[PDB]
Structure formats: C-alpha cells, structure tokens
Amino acid sequence: SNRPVMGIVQDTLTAVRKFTKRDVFLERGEVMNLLMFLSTWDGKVPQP
Amino acid sequence: EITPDLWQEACWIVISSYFDEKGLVRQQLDSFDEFIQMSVQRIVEDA
Amino acid sequence: MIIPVRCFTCGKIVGNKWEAYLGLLQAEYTEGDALDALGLKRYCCRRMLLAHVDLIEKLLNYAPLEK
Amino acid sequence: IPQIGDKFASRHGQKGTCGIQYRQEDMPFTCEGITPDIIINPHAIPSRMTIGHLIECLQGKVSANKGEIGDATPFNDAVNVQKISNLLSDYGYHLRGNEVLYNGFTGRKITSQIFIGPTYYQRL
Amino acid sequence: MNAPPAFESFLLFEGEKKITINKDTKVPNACLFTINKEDHTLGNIIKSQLLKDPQVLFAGYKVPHPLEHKIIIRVQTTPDYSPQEAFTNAITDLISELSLLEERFRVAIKDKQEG
Amino acid sequence: KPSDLHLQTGYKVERHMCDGDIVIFNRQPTLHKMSMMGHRVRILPWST
Amino acid sequence: SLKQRLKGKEGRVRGNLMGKRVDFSARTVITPDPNLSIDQVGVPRSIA
Amino acid sequence: VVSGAKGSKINISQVIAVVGQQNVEGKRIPFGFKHRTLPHFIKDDYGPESRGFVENSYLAGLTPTEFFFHAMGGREGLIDTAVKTAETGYIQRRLI
Amino acid sequence: QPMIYICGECHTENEIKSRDPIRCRECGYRIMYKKRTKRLVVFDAR
Amino acid sequence: PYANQPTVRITELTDENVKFIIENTDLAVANSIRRVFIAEVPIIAIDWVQIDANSSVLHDEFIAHRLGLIPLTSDDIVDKLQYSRDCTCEEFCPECSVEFTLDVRCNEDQTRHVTSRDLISNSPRVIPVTEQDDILIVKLRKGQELRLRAYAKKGFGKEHAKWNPTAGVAFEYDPDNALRHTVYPKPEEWPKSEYSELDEDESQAPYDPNGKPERFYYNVESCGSLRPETIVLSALSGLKKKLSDLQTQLSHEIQSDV
Amino acid sequence: TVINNWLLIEGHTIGIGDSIADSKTYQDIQNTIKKAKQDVIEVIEKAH
Amino acid sequence: GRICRPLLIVEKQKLLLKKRHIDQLKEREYNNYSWQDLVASGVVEYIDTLEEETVMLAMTPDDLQEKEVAYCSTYTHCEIHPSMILGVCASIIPFPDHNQSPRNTYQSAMGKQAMGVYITNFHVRMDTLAHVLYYPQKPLVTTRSMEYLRFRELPAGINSIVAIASYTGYNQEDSVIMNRSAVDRG
C-alpha cells in the first residue's frame, strides 16, 4: 500500500505530540540533555 | 421479621453457610457417591 | 509464607513486627490502630502486615520427614 | 528470581513481561520515600478498558491507609469511585490517587502527576 | 542464567580505563569523556556544575544504554579555555562544596545533640 | 593440544557471533515480507 | 502407509521438504528497548 | 486519542458516559428463555434494559444483567477472533 | 558402604544394601527418604 | 564559575530518622546525595551462608535469603573493614568479615522461633539491631533444627539491596511549586505539603521565572543498621571519595594525552 | 531517544482522574439516557 | 445431570428469609443450623434451567419488592447475590463489572497460570513442575467470594505499589518496569 510500515509507536507518539505543542519551552540544561541524544547533531546549539 | 437494609451482610451469611455445608466439589463427590452406592448394584442386578 | 524481613519498597524492617501485630489484634484493636501502634506510617509498609498470610503455621503441622 | 522477560499479570488481564529492572535510586519516588515496585504502561489502559484496574489501585490506597482489606464485590452500589475518593482524601492524598513523583535520575519533579498505588500482581 | 553479576555496576576489569578522553571533531574545543562503570549519580552533578561555568558552551551527559555501565559527558567550552580544564575544575568545585557541606553537617549534629 | 591450533590462510573458524553480525528475525505467523527482517546483533546481558 | 507418510501437512512434501527444522536458530521472549537502533536486536550472551 | 497512539473516541465515551447497546449477531440480545432474555424480566419486554442496552459506563460499573449482556457481546468478539485465524491462513496459503 | 535412609512414616533411620528390597524394620514402610548430603553447601545470601 | 556554599538546618534528630534542609545548592547535587543515601553508603550485611544442617520447613536458599536482609549494627566497624574482594587474606578474615553462628534445635512441643537473637557474633560491636521484638528468621517444629555459619562483609546498595541502610529517603524541593515544575490541572484538589507555608485560601504559590531549585527538604529514615546521621556523613564522604578517584583517573588521562 | 528523554522530564500517566467528568456532564448524560429511554417506551406503546 | 442453583423464595411480595434465620445461621457450630436446615425450612430451593423459564426472579430485594411505578409485582424467587453468577476464576477479579468482558476472560485464563502456594502439603508431593512462591500475599482489594474459595489461605501473587507512568521506554507495548531493590528483597 506504498506507505511505511514502521511509524512511531504509542508512547513516543504521545510524548512527541505533547512535545511539539506551541506552549512547550525548554531550559538550557534540558536542551543540552536532549541534544546529547541526537546522533545526527552537528554540534551547534540553535538560537533560542 | 424481615431484613430491610442489613441485607448486604445477611446474604453473605447464607453464602457462607452454603459453602460450609456443600463445598466447591459436591458435583464430583456426590456423583461418584451415588454411583458407587446405588448404580453399581443397579448394573449388577440389571444384567 | 513467613513474614518478609524488609518491606519490599522501603526496606523498613517489618519482619520483627508480625508477632506483635498478632498480639495487638487479639488485644482488641483495629488493624489500622495496630499498624500505627507498631509505627508504620507509609502504606507500603502497612500492606506488608495488613495483607500477609502466615502460611508457615500450616506447614508446621506436618511431621518432619527427616528426624 | 524475577528477571526481564518474566511474565507478570494483574487481576484484570493486564499481562506483560518485565522490560527492565532499575534499582531503587533510579526508580521515581513520591514526596515520601515510596518508589514503585512495578511501573506499567499508561497505554495499556484506554483501548483495553480495564477501569477496574484503576479502581483497584485507588481502593488499594484507601485500604492500605485505612488498615482494612477492602471490598470489591462486583454488584455493590455501596462502593462507587466517588466514595473511594472521599475516603482517600481524608488520609492526606489527592482525591483521585495521583501523586507527585520525583524523577529518579535528574531529581526534577515530573510535570504530570503520576497515578500510583497498590494493586495485586500475579507472577505467571 | 544470563544474569550479569552484581559487581558489574561498579567494578572495572583489566584493560578498562575509568575515564577516556576523545577530542570531538565536529566543533572546536569539545571533548567526549567516557566514564566507565558509573551512572547518573556522577554525571548529573558534573553536568550541573559544568553549567555553572560562564565559559562552557555545552555541557551534557548520556548513558548509551542502562544495561551497560558507562556515561559520556560532552563538554564544549569557549576558545582559549580547554574543556579538560573545565572538567578538572568542576570536580574540584564539587569536592569543595561537599567537604564544606560535610563540615556544616557535623556542626549541625553537634548543635542538635547538645541542645 | 596447542600444536594444531595454528592458523594459516584458508582455514575456517566457527566463531561465536559478536556485535555487528546480521541475523534474520521473524514472528509466526509470518504474514508479509516485513514479518521477517534482518537485524544487526548487539550483545546485551539479560536473556531476551 | 507410504501415501499417508507423504499426503499430510506433517508429511514429506509439506512437512519435511517445504518446511523443515533448521540449525543455527534461537527462540526467546522479546522485551522492549528504545536505546538501540531500529536494525539492531539485542541477543543474549548464552544464545550468542 | 488525539495523538492517535492508543484508543479512540468510542473508548472515551464508553469509559465516561455509556457502554451502549450490546449486540449478538448484529441484532439485540435474543430471547433465549421463552419470550424474555433473562428470568428477571417480564415476558415480551422489548425495552432498552431488557434487550441488552447498557446505560452505565465502565466508571460506574454494570448491573448484573448488563454484565451478562456485555459478556455476550464480548464472547461474540472472541469467537470471531478465534474462528478467523485458520480460514485467513488457508486463504493466504492458497494465494501464495 | 551402607546408605542411611529415613523411614518415611517411621522417621527413624536404617542401613540399606545393594540389591536389597526397600523395607523399614519398624513397620515395613516402603518409602525411604535419603539423608541430606555431607559435603558443604554455601549460599550467597542474595 | 565556582561552587555555591550550601548550608544545613536540622529540624529533628531521632534514633530512627533525621530531617534536615539543605539550602543554596543545585538540584543535581541534592538528588545525588539522596541516591548516595540509597546506594553508595556501605554497611555490614551477611553474604556467605554455609548451612551445616537444615530440617526446617523453609528450604536452604530461603533461609540464606532471610539472613541476607537482616540489618547489622555497623556504626563504626564499616569504616575499618576492607571490602572482602580487596583483602589480601586467605579468602576470609576478621579484617573483611564478621562471623556469625546459628545452632538451634527445637526439643519441645512449642513452636520455637529462631529469631535474630540466635545469630551469635564473634565481634561484639556487629550484632543484629534487635523495646522492639526480634526478627523472625524461621519457626521450628519439634525435631527440626538448623545449624549454619554466616560471614558478613562490607558492601553497598548498588551491589545488593541488603546493603541498603535507609528505610526511606523523602526528598522534596519547592513544596508550593513556585517554580511550576509540576503543573497541576486543578490545584484546589491537591493537598498541601508538610513544608507548605501558604494560607488555606491559596492553593499554590505564584510563578517566578527567575527562580531555581533551592532549600531541599530531606527525611532520611534509617533501617537500624546505621544511625541516621552517620548515613549522611558516610554518604558525603563516599561521594567526595568517588569524585576524588575520578579526579585521579582524570589526572592520569590528561598526563597520558600530553 | 530524544522524545523518551524529554518524557522523563515531562512524564505521562493515565488515571482515575482521567475517567471522571464533572457533575454537569453526568447530569447531561443521565438526562439524555432518561429522555431516550422514555422515547423507546413511547415507541413501544405506539407499537402495541 | 441437570444443573440447578439455589434461589430464595418470595411469597406475595416478601422474602421468606426472615431475621430469625440469620440469627440461627450466624450461630453455627452451636445450634447445628446448616444450609440444609434452611432448604428444609422452605426458604431457599434449587431451580434448574427449565424451571427458570417459568419463574419471575427478583435480582435484589432492596429494589424489587418495594412499591414504585411497578415493574411486575409478581416475583416468585429472588437471586441470593448476583456475584454468584461468576465462576471460581472470575470471582477473584476485583470490580469485574468495571472491566471490559474480553479482559475478564483473559484474566480467567491467567488466574489459572499464576504462581502461588498451590497446596499446603507441597513438601511431601513429588509433583512435576511445582511453582511455589516465597512471600505470597492476600489481596488488599478483595471480593467477598474469595473467603469461600479460600484464596486468602493459599494465595497467588503479591500486593505491589504500581505506578502508571510513561518512563524511560521499557514499559512500552505491554511490558513493565520492575524495581531491582524490591526484587532483591524477595
């Protein structure tokens, strides 16, 4: 059916829906904790 | 007289009396009991 | 079977409480009064005696195989 | 000894293997020192619809605080969830069993309020 | 069966370095510090102390896996200032405030037990 | 004996599998072609 | 009989030629892990 | 539900508000007794509660007649799940 | 060289021989229980 | 660029617990001191159980398990003992272990309770903690017995939970969430903390963006294996020792790079 | 990885607080059940 | 081979289970007043399935003998307790009417598979595959019917402080995170 089969399963999907809301803000330490887990991060912290 | 609203504790008394009298396996025991007490003699005489 | 030595969550030593818990039950307290008379504030320590079944007293009825 | 892969179940058809075992310092904890023994998925609830698991957990907090083995006959009408909540509120808890867990790794308290309390688990 | 023994959380072995420094190549002045046989109870304090320097541009740590006992602390500091220097100042600042905290705890015990 | 544990070029060695080996992983009932796929081995301690 | 040895789902064609028991295969319970990539399976040591 | 990770609006409606009409074979709970569904109901009772409509929710809990009618609908679902498997596998085998 | 078995219901102990019919001397009870081993056991208290 | 100066204020000190407040430190320092209360404090607990004889209804590994979890008075010996795997002895000695001996046969028609009192040490300081009753190890019918020798050794809570000195470590910061780390949907339903200082009209404190976690409230309840203040002293000493050994390995690695 | 590690900060649960509507909603539900039940009864008395 | 179950007996609109039966029935082992004396008293009787087609069965007396906008007012029997419609494995479920019914069926399957002290003389028995448990507990949340299956005497499972939390991601798809220190405490 020319679509993916993997997708994003349940708990990652609710946490990413709550994550990408408009009212979600992150402190500098929480950002540096999260960016530690990106494998594809080029080492540049984005502008807030 | 009757049991107006203490019925909730009065029914579990009669459930407890049932399972203290009968038990959980009266089917197996009473069935085998009536078998070996009456029905084996009925098989022997009905031959 | 026998009472656990520690509460599973805390690690509070609850194994020394069981016979005194039986004493406070037979001395006509409620179970909730007996627990905090033994001094168990956290409910995870209260379930350790409140819902124990002392099954080893059934196991001691049988005569010991080795003698 | 219970290890991961060992299959546990509630009294509601809520089975599941052990995913991981954390030590006590890694497990989250309330304002008091109480950590969980099990942490189950929140997604196990809403499609399976075992609300009786939640009510068993709430009546379990009420039972372990009150010091009595609580009653869960099915067709009662003397125990609904509002009476359970009013009994839980007297022991200094939230009405609906939610309790502020602190995180076990970072220590920052978790933004949501985690439903916690004692259920009865069966090892299969 | 396949239960790892209980001393795998903290005992090293022959041929295991406790700390391994790997200079990052993506950005200038950054290092990955691989600590073997530790957990969040070291890297969290080191991360929070490295956020207190005005000269650390990035301070993070992760465990790769919770069944394998190692952490990685990534440090990126400002140029002219080596991240190894920031790390060895974070450890000394922690030892400073913990020894001060221990002495003040002793004094508080002597206050409490003696009225 | 240690005299025949020598290796010259051309022997085979049936070695225990390490990280990075490829395995096929499936679930009965295998309905479609993504019910049987190839993974890379990672060696983790516990027995699952 | 011989025809009964061949005709079944447990026979020779379907039961032994089509689907047969294979060496080099393991079967254990799966438990989740979100800390490894989508093409990695974490096998035990005593399987490996 | 809004993320679509697990569940739907129907599960919210059945937990909070009302379980709804229980069905056996696409129609209501049939008269297994003589012209009544359970021996607690009067004969020829085509009402909501007699014929399997459950007005309670899973938060309030079901009355025993509603429990039994709900168990009937669930048994129909499990019969479907257990009988489906062999026929679908044989269709797959023939197609391949 | 004889093996000491515990006599089931009797709870007494007795010798036994190779190719010996298994009988107690007190009441001829047929079930014997082998005594606990004499070598050492050591348990990690974990 | 440096460490803030923390301070301690002890609200109570009992033989069970200690309740105190640590001000002017970071959150991760505070959480780590909690986690070192739970894990990294070493005490003395039984780890080598040799069952000489057993006839009790509980099997051997159950009795060795129950002898594991018994708390031992280790208030001053655990600083003197070496870790067992670190000692140069012939595999056990009085410098890395404490010998215990249990020898109980029930010769009476009463059910005889093998308690923690029947554990007999050779070291008079390291004895089981049990006013309070003794810790029930195993009950015995007449005819049954158990004899065993049990060596106790130094270890900490990461290794096994029988080396955990704490019953409970309550830890909370910002009990009226002025920081708003947790976000209550309806804060009227929520009970106030023990350390709340708001009047009963008010539910939770007003938000400040410029605030940070400070004034950490701890309640460290010991299980009896240590006094509740020497748990805290041993934890601070152990955390400073872990950091110092990490600094020594760091100095070796920096000298290896240069 | 990064959404699970944000979810440690956020946290996500489900509870019995999530299954209870306020009493105005329960009054609406019971009024609707009573209205539809009386409507079924009046359809029945038309059918008789 | 017919299959019956006892029901109370309702004369005009009143139960025949009077207060004096409860008074004589609380004091068992003294009056020797059994269940069979209550069957003999003409108060309960066994109704089988054919006869259920010709009986008007009150669910509970507190609702169904009081005058209202009357449903039938011609009851013959009254159910003793509705919880006695359930089996032995569906009786150990707390609040099973709040669940969904496939979940009740699946627990009825799993309750036969739970480890626990399966018998009291397990040390004598040479069973193949005996699974017994160290510290089994009775449920804090129990039914009344567990008193009669003797589930509080040979239980199967431990009361545990669960939390329902998304966490590191090892309780993802029907799995659970356990406490290593708790497991080390038995």
Ligand SMILES: [Zn+2]
């Ligand atoms: Zn506890």
Ligand SMILES: [Zn+2]
């Ligand atoms: Zn004899």
Ligand SMILES: [Zn+2]
């Ligand atoms: Zn030594």
